[PDB]
Design an enzyme around this catalytic site. Structure first.
Site, PDB file in Angstrom:
ATOM      1  N   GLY A  23      -7.717  34.724 -45.212  1.00  0.00           N
ATOM      2  CA  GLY A  23      -9.076  35.397 -45.462  1.00  0.00           C
ATOM      3  C   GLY A  23      -9.195  35.542 -47.054  1.00  0.00           C
ATOM      4  O   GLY A  23      -8.686  34.676 -47.608  1.00  0.00           O
ATOM      5  N   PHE A  25      -7.834  37.183 -49.291  1.00  0.00           N
ATOM      6  CA  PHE A  25      -6.877  37.207 -50.189  1.00  0.00           C
ATOM      7  C   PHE A  25      -5.683  36.475 -49.707  1.00  0.00           C
ATOM      8  O   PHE A  25      -4.645  36.418 -50.324  1.00  0.00           O
ATOM      9  CB  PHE A  25      -6.330  38.917 -50.392  1.00  0.00           C
ATOM     10  CG  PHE A  25      -7.173  39.729 -50.921  1.00  0.00           C
ATOM     11  CD1 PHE A  25      -7.581  39.806 -52.154  1.00  0.00           C
ATOM     12  CD2 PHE A  25      -7.795  40.824 -49.981  1.00  0.00           C
ATOM     13  CE1 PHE A  25      -8.575  40.588 -52.732  1.00  0.00           C
ATOM     14  CE2 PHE A  25      -8.615  41.697 -50.352  1.00  0.00           C
ATOM     15  CZ  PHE A  25      -9.072  41.691 -51.909  1.00  0.00           C
ATOM     16  N   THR A  86       1.503  45.759 -43.567  1.00  0.00           N
ATOM     17  CA  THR A  86       0.687  46.583 -42.963  1.00  0.00           C
ATOM     18  C   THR A  86       1.350  46.557 -41.268  1.00  0.00           C
ATOM     19  O   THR A  86       2.019  45.683 -41.018  1.00  0.00           O
ATOM     20  CB  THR A  86      -0.647  46.370 -42.674  1.00  0.00           C
ATOM     21  OG1 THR A  86      -0.960  44.980 -42.091  1.00  0.00           O
ATOM     22  CG2 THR A  86      -1.271  46.179 -44.149  1.00  0.00           C
ATOM     23  N   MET A  89      -0.669  43.508 -35.803  1.00  0.00           N
ATOM     24  CA  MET A  89      -1.861  43.448 -34.727  1.00  0.00           C
ATOM     25  C   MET A  89      -1.699  42.098 -34.090  1.00  0.00           C
ATOM     26  O   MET A  89      -2.218  41.100 -34.562  1.00  0.00           O
ATOM     27  CB  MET A  89      -2.953  43.714 -35.131  1.00  0.00           C
ATOM     28  CG  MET A  89      -3.059  44.903 -36.092  1.00  0.00           C
ATOM     29  SD  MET A  89      -2.895  46.472 -35.133  1.00  0.00           S
ATOM     30  CE  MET A  89      -4.789  46.333 -34.323  1.00  0.00           C
ATOM     31  N   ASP A 133     -16.883  46.920 -46.144  1.00  0.00           N
ATOM     32  CA  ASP A 133     -16.936  45.856 -45.567  1.00  0.00           C
ATOM     33  C   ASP A 133     -16.528  45.836 -44.218  1.00  0.00           C
ATOM     34  O   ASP A 133     -15.810  45.077 -43.777  1.00  0.00           O
ATOM     35  CB  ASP A 133     -16.087  44.732 -46.409  1.00  0.00           C
ATOM     36  CG  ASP A 133     -16.486  43.174 -46.000  1.00  0.00           C
ATOM     37  OD1 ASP A 133     -17.551  43.163 -45.358  1.00  0.00           O
ATOM     38  OD2 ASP A 133     -15.933  42.463 -46.571  1.00  0.00           O
ATOM     39  N   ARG A 137     -14.954  40.686 -38.404  1.00  0.00           N
ATOM     40  CA  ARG A 137     -13.730  40.089 -39.166  1.00  0.00           C
ATOM     41  C   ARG A 137     -12.666  40.792 -39.683  1.00  0.00           C
ATOM     42  O   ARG A 137     -11.548  40.543 -39.782  1.00  0.00           O
ATOM     43  CB  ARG A 137     -14.429  39.194 -40.193  1.00  0.00           C
ATOM     44  CG  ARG A 137     -15.093  39.765 -41.343  1.00  0.00           C
ATOM     45  CD  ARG A 137     -15.698  39.141 -42.459  1.00  0.00           C
ATOM     46  NE  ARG A 137     -16.329  39.961 -43.098  1.00  0.00           N
ATOM     47  CZ  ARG A 137     -17.829  40.035 -42.850  1.00  0.00           C
ATOM     48  NH1 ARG A 137     -18.247  39.328 -41.995  1.00  0.00           N
ATOM     49  NH2 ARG A 137     -18.328  40.849 -43.704  1.00  0.00           N
ATOM     50  N   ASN A 138     -12.956  42.124 -39.872  1.00  0.00           N
ATOM     51  CA  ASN A 138     -12.018  43.116 -40.586  1.00  0.00           C
ATOM     52  C   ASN A 138     -11.710  44.213 -39.488  1.00  0.00           C
ATOM     53  O   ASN A 138     -11.193  45.159 -39.866  1.00  0.00           O
ATOM     54  CB  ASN A 138     -12.715  43.828 -41.917  1.00  0.00           C
ATOM     55  CG  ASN A 138     -12.858  42.989 -42.923  1.00  0.00           C
ATOM     56  OD1 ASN A 138     -11.826  42.096 -43.142  1.00  0.00           O
ATOM     57  ND2 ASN A 138     -13.736  43.037 -43.611  1.00  0.00           N
ATOM     58  N   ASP A 151      -8.271  46.728 -43.723  1.00  0.00           N
ATOM     59  CA  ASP A 151      -8.772  46.072 -45.040  1.00  0.00           C
ATOM     60  C   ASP A 151      -9.781  47.266 -45.466  1.00  0.00           C
ATOM     61  O   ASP A 151     -10.465  46.814 -46.538  1.00  0.00           O
ATOM     62  CB  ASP A 151      -9.348  44.739 -45.000  1.00  0.00           C
ATOM     63  CG  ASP A 151      -8.033  43.870 -44.562  1.00  0.00           C
ATOM     64  OD1 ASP A 151      -7.349  43.557 -43.766  1.00  0.00           O
ATOM     65  OD2 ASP A 151      -7.671  43.013 -45.690  1.00  0.00           O
TER      66      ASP A 151
HETATM   67  C1  4L6 Z   1      -8.077  40.552 -41.237  1.00  0.00           C
HETATM   68  C2  4L6 Z   1      -7.576  39.920 -42.534  1.00  0.00           C
HETATM   69  C3  4L6 Z   1      -7.908  40.260 -43.566  1.00  0.00           C
HETATM   70  C4  4L6 Z   1      -7.552  39.310 -44.824  1.00  0.00           C
HETATM   71  C5  4L6 Z   1      -8.104  39.294 -46.007  1.00  0.00           C
HETATM   72  N1  4L6 Z   1      -7.334  38.268 -46.830  1.00  0.00           N
HETATM   73  N2  4L6 Z   1      -6.513  37.639 -45.745  1.00  0.00           N
HETATM   74  C6  4L6 Z   1      -6.697  38.403 -44.529  1.00  0.00           C
HETATM   75  C7  4L6 Z   1      -6.121  37.973 -43.361  1.00  0.00           C
HETATM   76  C8  4L6 Z   1      -6.627  38.798 -42.208  1.00  0.00           C
HETATM   77  C9  4L6 Z   1      -6.179  38.638 -40.644  1.00  0.00           C
HETATM   78  C10 4L6 Z   1      -6.580  37.416 -40.197  1.00  0.00           C
HETATM   79  C11 4L6 Z   1      -6.145  37.136 -38.794  1.00  0.00           C
HETATM   80  C12 4L6 Z   1      -5.113  37.724 -38.339  1.00  0.00           C
HETATM   81  C13 4L6 Z   1      -4.689  38.820 -38.964  1.00  0.00           C
HETATM   82  C14 4L6 Z   1      -3.570  39.751 -38.410  1.00  0.00           C
HETATM   83  N3  4L6 Z   1      -2.933  39.344 -37.146  1.00  0.00           N
HETATM   84  C15 4L6 Z   1      -3.165  40.929 -39.197  1.00  0.00           C
HETATM   85  C16 4L6 Z   1      -2.307  41.750 -38.696  1.00  0.00           C
HETATM   86  N4  4L6 Z   1      -2.184  43.059 -39.455  1.00  0.00           N
HETATM   87  O1  4L6 Z   1      -1.448  41.811 -37.716  1.00  0.00           O
HETATM   88  N5  4L6 Z   1      -3.839  41.211 -40.419  1.00  0.00           N
HETATM   89  N6  4L6 Z   1      -4.661  40.200 -40.804  1.00  0.00           N
HETATM   90  C17 4L6 Z   1      -5.219  39.331 -40.281  1.00  0.00           C
END
Ligand code: 4L6
Length: 271
Positions: A23, A25, A86, A89, A133, A137-138, A151
């Site tokens: 994503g 970041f 974090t 998930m 935001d 997606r979030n 996020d």
């Molecule tokens: C939700 C998300 C936000 C950002 C911002 N920068 N990079 C990102 C990646 C993700 C993201 C995408 C797909 C899967 C996950 C995920 N399983 C988890 C998690 N906490 O398990 N966190 N972010 C993800």
């Protein structure tokens, strides 16, 4: 332990297991902390984030805790390829989850996803904390199919001006009320508007809002008072709830407490 504040995780305690997604970041990986505890490791891309500002905010975020909010565990700050640690998930982002047609969701499941998000948002609202935001997606989905909000507040630290300029290529136009698009007026009520678009995404199984329009066209459409319309899977009562989030006058939009009550009413009436 010496060098570490209560918000600080030793990256040497991490075991990296697999990539989960990407994503604004950059990459997020699944890992174990101290060999045992599941975590997600947000590997913040160099130059993507206002890191010193974020780190200060992380201290406040450490105290945000709710069962429908993705938990912040800590930050690895002694490096500057920094990590945010974090809650893991396992089922990934809600947008991809909705788009997988194999799930064959019942509408009861869709309403439960809305309630999960609404509970997290009512909590944030009680702490006067804006998401800024909110969108599918979030949101993330755990191994039990529970949806949690992720996020929250992080858009404040995005250095890429394409994301932060209202006319930027990456600004969330399709999730924004008229007053955001017109005059950058963010408030509790801009989170409310975004929540309505999120309910629309859920009931649309992850379609893009205003899918046949560009961002410029969308901004014109909504500023003219026109709106998204009812997804096929939404009952009249559900549609009334999402539509209430899109009042032109921000002060006529509900609070998250009121939305939560309305969602529970519908669960009682149509389950
Ligand atoms: C939700 C998300 C936000 C950002 C911002 N920068 N990079 C990102 C990646 C993700 C993201 C995408 C797909 C899967 C996950 C995920 N399983 C988890 C998690 N906490 O398990 N966190 N972010 C993800």
């Amino acid at each position: 332990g010496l060098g570490y504040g209560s918000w600080e995780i030793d990256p040497k305690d991490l075991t990296f297991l697999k990539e989960l997604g990407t994503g604004q970041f950059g990459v997020v990986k699944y890992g174990k902390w101290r060999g045992q505890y599941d975590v997600a490791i947000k590997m913040i891309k160099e130059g993507s984030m206002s890191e010193d500002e974020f780190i200060e905010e992380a201290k406040v975020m450490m105290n945000l805790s709710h069962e429908k909010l993705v938990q912040l565990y800590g930050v690895c700050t002694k490096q500057r390829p920094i990590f945010i640690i974090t809650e893991y998930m396992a089922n990934g982002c809600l947008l991809n989850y909705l788009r997988e047609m194999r799930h064959r969701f019942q509408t009861q499941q869709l309403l439960e996803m809305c309630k999960d998000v609404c509970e997290a948002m009512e909590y944030l609202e009680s702490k006067q904390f804006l998401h800024r935001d909110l969108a599918a997606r979030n949101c993330l989905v755990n191994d039990q199919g529970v949806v949690k909000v992720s996020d929250f507040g992080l858009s404040r630290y995005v250095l890429d001006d394409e994301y932060t300029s209202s006319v930027g290529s990456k600004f969330p136009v399709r999730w924004s009320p008229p007053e955001v698009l017109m005059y950058s007026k963010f408030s509790s009520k801009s989170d409310i508007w975004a929540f309505g678009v999120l309910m629309w995404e859920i009931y649309s199984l992850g379609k893009m809002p205003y899918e046949r329009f560009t961002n410029s066209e969308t901004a014109e459409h909504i500023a003219q008072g026109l709106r998204l319309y009812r997804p096929h899977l939404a009952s009249e009562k559900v549609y009334t709830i999402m539509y209430s989030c899109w009042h032109e006058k921000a002060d006529e939009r509900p609070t998250f407490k009121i939305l939560l009550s309305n969602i529970l009413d519908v669960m009682d009436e149509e389950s």
